Amino acid sequence: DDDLVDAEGNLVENGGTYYLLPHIWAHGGGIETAKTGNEPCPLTVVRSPNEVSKGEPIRISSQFRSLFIPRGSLVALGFANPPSCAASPWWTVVDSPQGPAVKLSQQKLPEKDILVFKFEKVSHSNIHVYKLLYCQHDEEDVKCDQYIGIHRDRNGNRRLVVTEENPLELVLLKA
Amino acid sequence: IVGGYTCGANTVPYQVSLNSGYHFCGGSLINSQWVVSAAHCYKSGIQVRLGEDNINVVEGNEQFISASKSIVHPSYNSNTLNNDIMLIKLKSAASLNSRVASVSLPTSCASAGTQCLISGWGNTKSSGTSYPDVLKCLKAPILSDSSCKSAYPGQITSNMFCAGYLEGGKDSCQGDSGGPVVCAGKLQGIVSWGSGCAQKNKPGVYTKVCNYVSWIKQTIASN
Ligand SMILES: [Ca+2]
């Protein structure tokens, strides 16, 4: 009896693959990649336009050697099947013309650049739904004082970005 | 345990399995009433299972004992993974025999190169999972601090040490957490964390038990 649970009451496996869908059957569907702005290849993390697609299976990993994901543990999120052009399938947050945005990198990232996320359960509806926090390494004590949200750009790409009052609610579903 | 071997039934008498309806972490029996595990393995209502080999079925030598107190190190930081240690007090003393025995605490830190025994029921495969029914064993050396830090820049505090192979191929993995790292007959480490499993240049990182001994002895004497 811990925290992270999928869309089946079942516990989330550290290093397992899941579909990150929305709480509301609106907005969009699962998470996937897309080539936005002036990127050479799919480096932008977005929420599928299709509000019915399960998106890409996402690996959720904690540094801890536990089979489950420890409470209040920072996690890294990466695509099970990356775009190839990415040096790593792990997400990271970089400064973009639209503010800190969730993107993949062509350069190999260090642990501290990808382990910047953390889940927040929502007891509302009791259904397994979580808000995604973004943590930045301050000094001997990181600060998870920010959430990840959406930024519908010019072409309609639902980009995952760092926001303050536009948090994202997700339900993890095994893949 | 990735790249290890079947220990053998009751050949690691101090190895314990923390159960909450199912095995979720390992631990180390230090005396008839106390178990040492990882702080990140904290859970309420933990049942401690001693004398285990095949964790899926009863074989005659197990002892199932509920935990009455679970004490997570005061300085545990789930963010930085630092101070990853937890003490468990059994609400009932364990019957010490040949299959159930305590492992002594180190009153001095072990040096790099010392060979250690790491055990658990965690994942045994790479880029895929396969959890064993029985206890797996692995022999690995303590690595030097400079090497540990070069493998995990900015992530290694003084309460951690690396053990394993820079070459990769052998290491602890998901499900081994809280487990024992015994060297020269003393519990020098606790299976804590790592980047992946048995990956190249990413050896297992373990809680440095020798820094917490005075605290462990103190807690045991007043709880
Ligand atoms: Ca058994």
Side-chain angles (χ1 to χ4, degrees):
Chain A
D1 46 296
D2 56 66
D3 294 64
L4 271 76
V5 189
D6 55 24
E8 296 183 59
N10 293 306
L11 282 163
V12 172
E13 303 160 48
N14 182 7
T17 62
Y18 298 77
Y19 292 123
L20 280 52
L21 311 169
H23 181 187
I24 323 307
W25 305 145
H27 315 70
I31 299 179
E32 59 192 51
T33 66
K35 184 177 62 63
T36 69
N38 326 100
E39 303 179 306
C41 54
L43 298 177
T44 300
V45 176
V46 303
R47 173 177 278 180
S48 184
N50 189 319
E51 283 171 37
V52 185
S53 175
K54 288 184 288 64
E56 301 288 318
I58 306 300
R59 285 191 184 297
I60 302 171
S61 178
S62 177
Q63 293 289 280
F64 288 121
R65 300 283 227 212
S66 57
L67 39 71
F68 61 81
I69 291 188
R71 324 183 175 190
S73 173
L74 298 173
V75 302
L77 303 173
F79 301 93
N81 315 301
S84 174
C85 76
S88 41
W90 307 101
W91 306 356
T92 186
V93 187
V94 300
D95 284 356
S96 70
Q98 301 76 193
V102 177
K103 291 194 190 302
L104 290 173
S105 175
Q106 299 205 277
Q107 294 300 307
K108 181 67 71 170
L109 303 317
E111 281 86 1
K112 281 179 172 295
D113 270 1
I114 61 179
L115 299 154
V116 302
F117 300 105
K118 175 181 293 180
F119 285 113
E120 265 240 300
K121 177 55 172 288
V122 183
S123 292
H124 202 298
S125 179
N126 197 181
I127 177 180
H128 317 84
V129 184
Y130 313 78
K131 279 181 292 300
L132 179 56
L133 322 194
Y134 165 60
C135 320
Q136 44 230 301
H137 305 259
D138 184 355
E139 189 179 60
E140 291 296 70
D141 194 61
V142 302
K143 300 185 296 71
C144 292
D145 62 296
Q146 282 190 295
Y147 291 57
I148 287 297
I150 299 296
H151 173 71
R152 282 87 172 186
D153 71 325
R154 306 172 60 73
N155 292 167
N157 291 303
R158 306 166 181 293
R159 312 186 185 192
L160 270 63
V161 302
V162 168
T163 69
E164 190 63 14
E165 284 302 72
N166 290 174
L168 278 176
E169 290 176 0
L170 304 163
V171 294
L172 318 177
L173 181 63
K174 185 70 188 68
Chain B
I1 306 296
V2 176
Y5 55 100
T6 296
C7 296
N10 310 291
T11 56
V12 181
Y14 52 76
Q15 169 87 225
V16 328
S17 171
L18 305 180
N19 185 286
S20 65
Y22 61 94
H23 163 89
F24 63 90
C25 285
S28 293
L29 186 72
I30 52 170
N31 79 202
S32 78
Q33 279 170 53
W34 292 78
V35 164
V36 175
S37 187
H40 76 265
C41 286
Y42 169 79
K43 277 187 171 51
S44 169
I46 288 166
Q47 183 188 73
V48 175
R49 331 244 284 205
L50 310 168
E52 286 283 19
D53 190 43
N54 187 308
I55 50 161
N56 291 297
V57 306
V58 168
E59 301 179 291
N61 297 297
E62 304 90 336
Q63 287 183 54
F64 291 8
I65 305 168
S66 190
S68 57
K69 294 183 190 174
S70 295
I71 308 166
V72 178
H73 191 283
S75 294
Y76 174 50
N77 193 321
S78 67
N79 298 308
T80 62
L81 316 165
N82 198 27
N83 303 103
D84 192 23
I85 181 171
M86 177 189 49
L87 293 175
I88 297 174
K89 187 179 184 177
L90 308 180
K91 53 180 58 183
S92 189
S95 302
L96 302 178
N97 54 240
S98 67
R99 291 163 165 56
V100 177
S102 66
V103 60
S104 49
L105 296 178
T107 53
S108 59
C109 300
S111 63
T114 294
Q115 193 71 187
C116 304
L117 175 70
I118 303 169
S119 47
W121 293 280
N123 186 328
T124 61
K125 303 292 76 188
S126 296
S127 192
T129 78
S130 176
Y131 297 85
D133 292 65
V134 308
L135 194 59
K136 289 296 178 173
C137 271
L138 168 71
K139 286 181 179 180
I142 289 173
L143 302 188
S144 66
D145 304 71
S146 54
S147 186
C148 195
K149 293 181 183 176
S150 288
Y152 293 108
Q155 292 144 273
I156 309 300
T157 74
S158 43
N159 299 305
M160 325 173 176
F161 74 78
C162 290
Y165 309 79
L166 313 169
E167 173 210 315
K170 306 162 108 292
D171 194 9
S172 52
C173 199
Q174 279 62 233
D176 291 317
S177 263
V181 178
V182 176
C183 333
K186 301 297 190 300
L187 178 69
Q188 293 285 187
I190 295 169
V191 177
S192 185
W193 63 277
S195 279
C197 296
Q199 303 286 294
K200 172 174 295 183
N201 212 297
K202 301 296 181 182
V205 187
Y206 304 82
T207 306
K208 194 171 180 173
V209 181
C210 63
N211 297 349
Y212 304 100
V213 178
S214 285
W215 173 70
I216 297 174
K217 286 183 173 184
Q218 178 275 144
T219 305
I220 287 179
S222 58
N223 287 280

